Design an enzyme around this catalytic site. Structure first.
Site, PDB file in Angstrom:
ATOM      1  N   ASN D  81       0.895  -1.058  -0.492  1.00 41.87           N
ATOM      2  CA  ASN D  81      -0.089  -0.102   0.134  1.00 41.87           C
ATOM      3  C   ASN D  81       1.031   1.578  -0.116  1.00 41.87           C
ATOM      4  O   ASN D  81      -0.330   2.403  -0.347  1.00 41.87           O
ATOM      5  CB  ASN D  81      -1.075  -0.105   1.394  1.00 41.87           C
ATOM      6  N   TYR D 146       1.937   8.668 -12.129  1.00 42.68           N
ATOM      7  CA  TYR D 146       1.001   7.882 -10.603  1.00 42.68           C
ATOM      8  C   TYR D 146       0.852   6.901 -11.125  1.00 42.68           C
ATOM      9  O   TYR D 146       0.393   5.515 -10.757  1.00 42.68           O
ATOM     10  CB  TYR D 146       0.258   8.576  -9.729  1.00 42.68           C
ATOM     11  N   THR D 181     -11.251  10.086   3.919  1.00 42.45           N
ATOM     12  CA  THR D 181     -11.504   9.626   4.911  1.00 42.45           C
ATOM     13  C   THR D 181     -13.254  10.796   5.368  1.00 42.45           C
ATOM     14  O   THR D 181     -12.989  11.386   5.601  1.00 42.45           O
ATOM     15  CB  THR D 181     -10.808  10.577   6.331  1.00 42.45           C
TER      16      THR D 181
END
Ligand SMILES: [Mg+2]
Ligand SMILES: [Mg+2]
Lengths: 239, 239, 239, 239
Positions: D81, D146, D181
């Site tokens: 991760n 990315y 989040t």
């Protein structure tokens, strides 16, 4: 060059099928086009020129597909372009329309391929191009049944490639994105519609642009291409 | 026809790159090929003919890539074919070889594209073709790093298609399966190797067959094709 | 935990459907299974336990599908597992068998989903899992029609995800590779069959292993998973 | 249940990695998390509880990766991760940032896997989960590098699945869509942002929802899942 090759294009009297047939006739193929209406079919064949001929056929009618195979039994190139595309939400979709969509788009093409490919395999060469759609690879509300029929064709591209490839017969899909016959006014003005504005190329395709991918896969230039999907969609699948 | 277009092919002195350059020069493009060795580079340029010219370049060296972009600054067609392909199991793979593989296969092509595409976008047209591999779509033991570098190119095809498409610049990948220069003896004999025997078409591709897919995507015939992968692999991906 | 949720599993009297139903009942769902035979259906429901109940249904018969929807109208989890899978080469495939395959595997599931999803959307939550097959993503000779029906389901997963997602209803596919009920002897001996030997994991799946992926997608654990295919195939798709 | 299994989560001090580690510790795994900052690392380990421990590591530094493997040599579950994600257009992308992105996201994970998987193969069991991104499957302007690094991981998932599968070691990718989040206020109000409004589920994921897919693939429940991508993106890939 396609000299000495016979190319059958179902639904070849307008749109993508007409322009695919036009390109192959101009490259020397003996072209046969199908469609439901005899008058437009003969006018389409005269528009294509080069000895292109019309055979009336309804892909949703197996008796008609049988007669089509009987009238064009020996075929080197087969473009499966015939199809219907009515839209409805899943909650609104009727049974009759569902059955017609699969009978026309899948069932007719399946058994036409079964007949035509038998001759290709016996001869050791042939190319089959299935016309599908971006709606078979991404989810577009209203296109559930239409997308599903063309997804069935995408899988048949792979199975047929495996079954016919040992005898030199190639099978591929062309997956078109938004396509529209250009109008005389479309090089003028400034407005960009919402459909085009979502694609990387910011425009819709003219049918002749889809047909160029069909010609490529149909032709000996794509001699090592089989079992695959060629996306012709202005970037639609990639975004 | 590619008359008036400049086509740059990295690694164009042998194999797929040489045959891609040969086809584009025969279609009227002003072709520039690159490679590491000046003598073979000049012989390759003379083999292609049609005014094709050689520029020495090492894609793993950013100073060399800078000089390549400086010597061929205005490019309408870019074929990113330069690359290395050493194999090793993940457990045997060394750090030096990993770094060289990504620096050569990904880093050099990335910044060459960044320079060449700037001119294409300013001019409103261009086509970029990344050469990848079936090992970037399926798992083949021994090809972890090589496959990973070409998978990076597959994603860059999609991102670049989205970034450059509004200015008429198309970006696609050609994913070759097993490819081998045919020998004079290969129309004779009966033996079929294990590699070919796994593919639907039961043979390996000659480089010229891969090059036909490159020519298609590079050319205005593929005017509505962008962000996509064209599989040229005898059916390898489909099975 | 699935307490308070009703899960309908078509074809839930054996194999993958039985084990999917068993897992969901053990997690607290009120499970309804369907199948063609009432005696085996009641024995399967007693095998699952936990108040699981059987409803006789033939997915190839729209009258029967209508009665199934009437008997289980309010459903939070729907696993579309009912299907037939006869094999034949494209050249051998008969018309009757083709029509039965699509009517059972596609048509019945489509309109069952149309009814069940209407209630899910009204309630603002639900999960639909379509069972497909590796033969819908790769070409396997003999599986043309079967693979095509399940490829239609894969596309319907995406369209339904787009149509139902705004109301909190998720839709996914589970694509199983080779699956076989394990026998008592299979931990003994040394022989490895050709089917298993082609997969990275070198074995076939027990149905309970496929069912674990179904349970995951059906359950609130997969609350952000929709429109996707979960491959449960020992690596078959990846090679 | 993961009792008796050791799970290593790189970048496990916040976001998806923290919540993946939390779930596995609550299921009985001995969890090791990594991160760059010792203070936050120890607080994250105390937040996870259940004996979870922190090891400082910089995935872009091979000396640090070597020490990480030395400190956690025997690992049954590995979640890759750790990664950085700076954005820039291809025309703006700098060389330094490109090199850091691939060294951190690809190079560090590659050789960490090479070390950890050697022990898994010797023991005959293990599960490796690579965290990727929707930007590795679709083109999003600004994410070229990315997306490319995570596309390299997607291919490594397939190659590693083929290389390690014969010894019972599974390898899969989790491809997250938009993730944020949740804040205390987010069950209130009516505004829907443009990012969420493009997804079928019309919302962004909380990291804990991505972590549920990681837990599934890491656990024996996914015993027949390998070489595959699990999309956890609210439908992003499907549209
Ligand atoms: Mg019927
Ligand atoms: Mg470096």
């Amino acid at each position: 060059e396609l000299e000495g090759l016979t190319a059958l294009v179902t639904g070849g009297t307008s749109g993508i099928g007409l322009e695919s047939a036009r390109l192959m006739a101009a490259e020397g193929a003996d072209v046969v086009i199908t469609g439901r209406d005899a008058q437009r079919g003969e006018q389409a064949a005269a528009d294509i020129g080069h000895g292109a001929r019309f055979v009336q056929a309804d892909l949703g009618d197996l008796d008609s597909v049988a007669d089509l195979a009987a009238q064009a039994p020996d075929v080197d190139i087969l473009v499966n372009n015939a199809g219907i595309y009515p839209q409805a939400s899943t909650f609104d979709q009727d049974v009759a329309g569902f059955q017609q969509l699969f009978d026309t788009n899948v069932r007719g093409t399946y058994f036409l391929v079964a007949a035509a490919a038998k001759g290709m395999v016996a001869r050791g060469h042939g190319s089959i191009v299935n016309i599908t759609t971006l709606a078979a690879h991404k989810g577009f509300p209203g296109t559930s049944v239409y997308g599903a029929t063309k997804a069935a064709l995408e899988s048949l591209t792979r199975t047929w490639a495996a079954e016919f490839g040992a005898n030199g017969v190639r099978v591929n899909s062309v997956s078109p994105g938004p396509t529209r016959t250009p109008t005389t006014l479309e090089q003028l003005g400034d407005f960009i519609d919402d459909v085009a504005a979502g694609l990387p190329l910011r425009r819709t395709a003219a049918p002749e642009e889809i047909a160029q991918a069909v010609l490529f896969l149909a032709s000996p230039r794509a001699s090592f291409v089989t079992g695959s999907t060629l996306y012709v969609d202005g970037g639609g699948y990639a975004v």
